[PDB]
């Protein structure tokens, strides 16, 4: 039949995919250090012989919202949030390094510093931070310097042991990977530490998802979705009527 | 009246193409820069500003454009179909083809280089400039041209379109064919 049936179907299909991207945003409102995902549609025309009447649209992710997340003051010593722009460099389960903004850190039984996702926290030597096992008081600095008190030591024996690797690259050069870690679009790009990134210890950075912004985008995808499915029915209606040209 | 900075913003797309179709603008500010393509079709604009820069292609089909001043930079093509241009200035940096079909064009710059196709279809031009170089297809159909210069260069096909050519260039190397 007419190709407008599939031209509208290819549009309704993308609206559902855009709806899925907004659904993931609203599910992650309470998530810690979550960067909102933007949804956009690209107009692609079928170039060739004939009148230029058919143009497809596909939904794609143009970028992410890198605005500062909501800061939650918790009073916990091992809670860190990046003041302004900046990232925390961590290595995932496989070992590939990446940037994260979740500062819900913790100390394991061996002293290794991890975050809430389990990623190991990189240090001054581009290696995971391993603090002494018998600690007494962890006091993270504003610049990322970790000053710990050995167990049984006097309060005046406060010494720095490591400095968290904070990286502030261009946000437009970062893409979210398959596990929520932002990495460089260009492969084999070294993550260079920055001396301007600051860590506000004792607070946790929340999500930056604008709940109303997603809701008002939802009510427009639904209407656009319903208009296209009416086009599918009216293209079906036209073909059924034209079925009476071979009756003879 | 004339286009302002705020009026410019209301005729620009996401990638930076200025659309002035049917808009009542008479003159553009000097030193004008366009991020992408420029469209001044059907406009009462009779003159393009000096120092004009277009990051894309200039579209002036069926417009009132008459004068383009030298120094204009156009990255894409120039489409002046149906406009009121009578002469082409010297020193225009054109990154694409030049379509001058159905224009009152009479004179062309000497040793003009067209990086794309050239059209003089149905134009009152009497003779082509010496040393003309065309990297694409040349359409002279329906024009008043009947004598080619001593030397010319066309890297594509040459379409006569109906006009009769009597004096062919002495030095001519053609990458394509000649069609009547």
């Amino acid at each position: 039949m007419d190709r407008a049936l599939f031209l509208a179907m290819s549009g309704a299909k993308q609206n559902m995919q855009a709806l899925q991207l907004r659904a993931n945003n609203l599910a992650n409102v309470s998530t810690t250090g979550f960067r909102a995902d933007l949804a956009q549609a690209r107009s692609m025309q079928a170039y060739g012989e004939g009148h230029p009447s058919r143009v497809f649209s596909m939904t794609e992710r143009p970028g992410h919202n890198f605005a500062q997340g909501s800061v939650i003051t918790t009073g916990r010593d091992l809670d860190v949030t990046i003041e302004g722009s900046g990232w925390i460099s961590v290595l995932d389960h496989t070992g590939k390094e990446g940037l994260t903004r979740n500062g819900n850190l913790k100390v394991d039984q061996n002293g290794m510093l991890t975050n809430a996702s389990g990623h190991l926290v990189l240090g001054e030597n581009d290696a995971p931070i391993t603090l002494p096992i018998p600690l007494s008081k962890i006091e993270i600095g504003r610049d990322g310097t970790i000053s710990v008190l050995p167990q049984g030591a006097p309060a005046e024996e406060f010494q720095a042991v490591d400095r968290i690797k904070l990286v502030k690259p261009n946000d437009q050069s970062l893409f979210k990977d398959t596990n929520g870690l932002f990495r460089h679009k260009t492969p084999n790009q070294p993550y260079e530490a920055d001396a301007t990134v600051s860590l506000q210890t004792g607070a946790i950075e929340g999500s930056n998802v604008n709940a109303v912004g997603e809701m008002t985008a939802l009510i427009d995808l639904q209407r656009q979705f319903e208009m296209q499915v009416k086009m599918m029915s009216t293209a079906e209606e036209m073909d059924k009527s034209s079925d009476s040209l071979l009756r003879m | 009246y004339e286009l302002d900075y705020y009026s410019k913003f209301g005729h620009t797309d996401n990638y930076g193409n200025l659309d002035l179709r049917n808009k009542p603008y008479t003159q553009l500010p000097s030193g004008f820069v366009v991020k992408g393509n420029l469209n001044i079709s059907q406009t009462p604009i009779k003159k393009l500003p000096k120092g004009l820069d277009v990051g894309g292609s200039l579209e002036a089909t069926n417009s009132a454009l008459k004068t383009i001043r030298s120094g204009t930079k156009i990255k894409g093509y120039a489409n002046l179909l149906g406009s009121k241009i009578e002469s082409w200035p010297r020193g225009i940096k054109l990154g694409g083809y030049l379509n001058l079909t159905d224009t009152p064009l009479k004179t062309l710059p000497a040793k003009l280089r067209v990086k794309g196709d050239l059209s003089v279809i149905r134009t009152p031009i009497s003779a082509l400039p010496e040393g003309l170089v065309v990297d694409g297809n040349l359409y002279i159909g329906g024009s008043a041209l009947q004598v080619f210069p001593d030397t010319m260069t066309v890297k594509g096909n040459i379409f006569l379109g109906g006009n009769k050519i009597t004096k062919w260039p002495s030095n001519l190397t053609l990458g394509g064919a000649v069609a009547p």
Partner: peptide, 24 residues
């Protein structure tokens, strides 16, 4: 001819004049 602002279905090339449209 007819309409003055018809489109062209050929992909942009910026070097070849589109002959799909009635370029007169």
């Amino acid at each position: 001819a007819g309409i003055p602002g018809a489109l062209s279905n050929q992909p942009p090339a910026d070097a070849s004049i589109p002959q799909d449209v009635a370029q007169m």
